[PDB]
Amino acid sequence: MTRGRVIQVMGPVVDVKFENGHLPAIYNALKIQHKARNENEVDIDLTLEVALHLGDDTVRTIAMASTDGLIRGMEVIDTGAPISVPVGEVTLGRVFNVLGEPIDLEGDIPADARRDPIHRPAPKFEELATEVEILETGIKVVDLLAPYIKGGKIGLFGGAGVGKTVLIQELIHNIAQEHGGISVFAGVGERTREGNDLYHEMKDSGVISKTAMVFGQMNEPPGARMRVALTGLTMAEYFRDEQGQDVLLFIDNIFRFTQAGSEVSALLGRMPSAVGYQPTLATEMGQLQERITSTAKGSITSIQAIYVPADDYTDPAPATTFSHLDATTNLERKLAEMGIYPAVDPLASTSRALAPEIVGEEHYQVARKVQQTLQRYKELQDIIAILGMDELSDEDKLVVHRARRIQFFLSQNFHVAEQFTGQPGSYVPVKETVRGFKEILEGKYDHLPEDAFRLVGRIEEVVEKAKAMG
């Protein structure tokens, strides 16, 4: 009969009793659908997730929505599997909640469509790739000074108004154009107005046709705010496995995911750990991140925005998050005013892939030389600021001359910016970027004005622009 009965309702925690020998498994999804039998009842459509077996055929669950109106003794039905979310082509260009139901106004998905469980074991050690590969993003600064690894995690740092959404849209566009792979955006604990603004930006940028969007509203219960990330990840896993392509995955804020997990643990009554976090923080983060890997017939790479509580990098949540990251990109407000539209800090950004064994000896040498030149300019800046210019030596003058050219050449024109500027976008291969930066370091284009190196793309655009303007 697999029919349960509600016996306890305490906020977002609901306890259900089943007939003996027919209890649902852990992480299963239970449905409650009730119709008002009289004037002292309300309609209810609620979904629960099994968490514990308390004994005496009783199961403790966490609600996915409001529990108001629940009555002890209401019928509960077990679906026999964890939460199932539709996958496939039907999810492209759509907006979903944690339950997998569409949020936008274009209609419901047919009930016969394929659905996949939210909870799934991580891929086996047998299936993983045996080598490290570079994901060519087409952005000069990223491809040069902080390469991306297929199947790796990239930490994104920055505030508002610095270009985070523009960078995200450009990454999605470039990946879809040059690799045929779609991207997935997962909003965890975001602000609703900001989510709507991002939706409209992706709509009018022409990018939304190649992405699937999942939002966990900030007013949603902690269970939803915790399972939204898994919903997005299992949306992306279908395209990793069946279509065999390289897929992106964006997380709005993973710290809010950890906070939702902590709230769920506090509600469940487990004893707290560390600075008040759940004892299972490390294993929850591992279960989330270990499914983002590069297998033999695909790869999922994730760009995650990270919030540091109280600016403390030793806090348990950022400390656990950082143990999974493979790269880091920092967006700089100073560069934002200076006019470098990508605004990626060339010195703060770091990547594990910047090694000779991975990117090549020539690439490593060029990157190291560029970083050293930028650093040297950084120290010289105060000398130019306080002392006279004549105090600079000949080599210092040459370094100052080269550094501005390099810094302006790190900028790039994006396809997304076309709707606001007019000029088309450009996709720059990594080898072309390396060749251009090596030529700049050689002094092959010293005579060109520093303004000729702004928003060009490849190196030939610099000389073409210089000839056009003079």
Partner 1 sequence: LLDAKASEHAARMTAMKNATDNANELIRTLTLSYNRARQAAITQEITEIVAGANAL
Partner 2 sequence: QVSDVGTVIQVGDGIARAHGLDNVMSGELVEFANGVMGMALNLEENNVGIVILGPYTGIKEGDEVRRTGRIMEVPVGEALIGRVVNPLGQPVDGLGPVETTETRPIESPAPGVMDRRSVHEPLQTGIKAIDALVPIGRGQRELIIGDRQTGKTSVAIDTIINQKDQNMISIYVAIGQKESTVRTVVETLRKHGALDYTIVVTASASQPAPLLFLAPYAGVAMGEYFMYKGKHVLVVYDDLSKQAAAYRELSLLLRRPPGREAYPGDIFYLHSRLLERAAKLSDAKGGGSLTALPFVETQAGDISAYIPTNVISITDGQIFLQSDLFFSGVRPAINAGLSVSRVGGAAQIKAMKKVAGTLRLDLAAYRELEAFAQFGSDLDKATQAKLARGARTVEVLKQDLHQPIPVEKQVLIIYALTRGFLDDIPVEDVRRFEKEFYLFLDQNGQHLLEHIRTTKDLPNEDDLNKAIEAFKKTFVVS
Binding residues, by number, are 158-166, 194, 341, 352
| Three-state SS at 55 | strand
Among 81, 162, 266, 336, binds partner 2 (CB under 8 A): 266
Q: Which does 352 bind (CB under 5 to 8 A by kind): partner 1, partner 2, none?
A: partner 2
Q: Are 425 and 418 in contact (CB under 8 A)?
A: yes
Among 7, 275, 296, 398, binds partner 1 (CB under 8 A): 275
136: annotated active-site residue: no
Of 49, 170, 190, 237, catalytic: 190
Question: How many residues interact with partner 1 (rule CB under 8 A)?
Answer: 11
Q: Confirm or reject binding of residue 385 to partner 1 (CB under 8 A).
A: no
72 closest CA partner among 1, 28, 137, 8: 8
Q: Which does 338 bind (CB under 5 to 8 A by kind): partner 1, partner 2, none?
A: none
> Rounded to the nearest whole angstrom, what is the least distance from the CB of residue 142 to partner 2 in the complex?
19
Q: Are 264 and 62 in contact (CB under 8 A)?
A: yes
Q: Confirm or reject binding of residue 330 to partner 2 (CB under 8 A).
A: no
Residues 6+ apart with CB under 8 A from 239: 181, 182, 245, 247, 298
403 closest CA partner among 433, 373, 378: 373
Both tokens of 197, joined, read 């603004």
Among 276, 388, 422, 470, binds partner 1 (CB under 8 A): 276
Q: Confirm or reject binding of residue 349 to partner 2 (CB under 8 A).
A: no
Q: Confirm or reject binding of residue 310 to partner 1 (CB under 8 A).
A: yes
Q: Confirm or reject binding of residue 312 to partner 1 (CB under 8 A).
A: yes
Q: Confirm or reject binding of residue 130 to partner 1 (CB under 8 A).
A: no
Report residue 403 CA to chain centroid gap.
Answer: 32
Q: Show contacts with partner 2 in window 109-128 (CB under 8 A).
A: 119, 121-126, 128
Binding site feature residues for ADP = 161-166, 341
DSSP 314: T
337: annotated active-site residue: no
> Rounded to the nearest whole angstrom, what is the least distance from the CB of residue 309 to partner 1 in the complex?
10
Instruction: For residue 218, count other CB atoms closer than 10 A to its CB.
Output: 15
Q: Confirm or reject binding of residue 73 to partner 1 (CB under 8 A).
A: no
CA distance 337 to 21: 66
Token pair 């269970």 in the structure block, residue: 223
Q: Confirm or reject binding of residue 388 to partner 1 (CB under 8 A).
A: no
Among 100, 155, 221, 436, binds partner 2 (CB under 8 A): 221
164: annotated active-site residue: yes
- DSSP for 442-462, please give it: TTTTSSS-GGGGSS--SHHHH
CA distance 381 to 237: 48
Binding mask 45-84 for partner 2 (x = CB under 8 A): ------xxxxx-x--------xxxxxxxx-----------
Q: Show contacts with partner 2 in window 381-420 (CB under 8 A).
A: none
Among 11, 244, 424, 443, binds partner 2 (CB under 8 A): 11
For the chain, report the end-to-end CA distance as a whole number of angstroms: 84
**Which residues make beta-bridge pairs with 190?**
217
Q: Are 415 and 425 in contact (CB under 8 A)?
A: yes
- Segment (H or E) for 148: strand 148-149
DSSP 18: -
414 closest CA partner among 344, 332, 352, 326: 344
Q: Show contacts with partner 2 in window 310-329 (CB under 8 A).
A: 310, 313-314, 319, 322-324
Among 21, 110, 269, 388, binds partner 1 (CB under 8 A): 269
Q: Which does 289 bind (CB under 5 to 8 A by kind): partner 2, partner 1, none?
A: partner 2
- Of 274 and 441, the one with the shorter C-beta distance to partner 1 is 274
Q: Confirm or reject binding of residue 286 to partner 2 (CB under 8 A).
A: yes
Q: Are 103 and 47 in contact (CB under 8 A)?
A: no
Q: Confirm or reject binding of residue 371 to partner 2 (CB under 8 A).
A: no
- Residues marked as catalytic: 164, 190-191
Residue ranges binding partner 1 (CB under 8 A) = 266, 269, 271-272, 274-276, 310, 312, 314-315
